[PDB]
Write a protein that binds this ligand. Structure first.
Ligand SMILES: *[C@@H]1O[C@H](CO)[C@@H](O)[C@H](O)[C@H]1NC(C)=O
Lengths: 50, 39
């Protein structure tokens, strides 16, 4: 989508594997604010907004 | 043939969706208990 009409996908009731994203070589920026990438694969959240 | 659904008119902000396997002289007796404890 365009940045004025940015797509929001609500992610619920599943298992989120964040190490697949973190260990990928295809991403240039993976800057996390408020949480560290190492404990993302452990913690649990109510909803994820993408 | 089931061809009439008139239960709602809108759906705006969804927080949770869950699709599952079907739960189901009078021949069947269905007992259900619904509880709301700590969310
Ligand atoms: C809920 O829906 C209304 C209209 O559909 C919208 O204006 C509002 O921003 C929504 N709120 C949230 C938290 O999604």
């Amino acid at each position: 989508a365009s940045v004025y009409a940015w797509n929001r996908k609500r992610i619920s009731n599943c298992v989120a594997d964040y190490s697949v994203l973190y260990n990928s070589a295809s991403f240039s920026t993976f800057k996390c604010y408020g949480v560290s990438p190492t404990k993302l694969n452990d913690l649990c959240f109510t909803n994820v907004y993408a | 043939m089931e061809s009439e659904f008139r239960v709602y008119s809108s759906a705006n902000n969804c927080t949770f969706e869950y699709v599952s396997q079907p739960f189901l002289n009078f021949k069947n007796l269905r007992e259900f208990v619904f509880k709301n404890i700590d969310g």
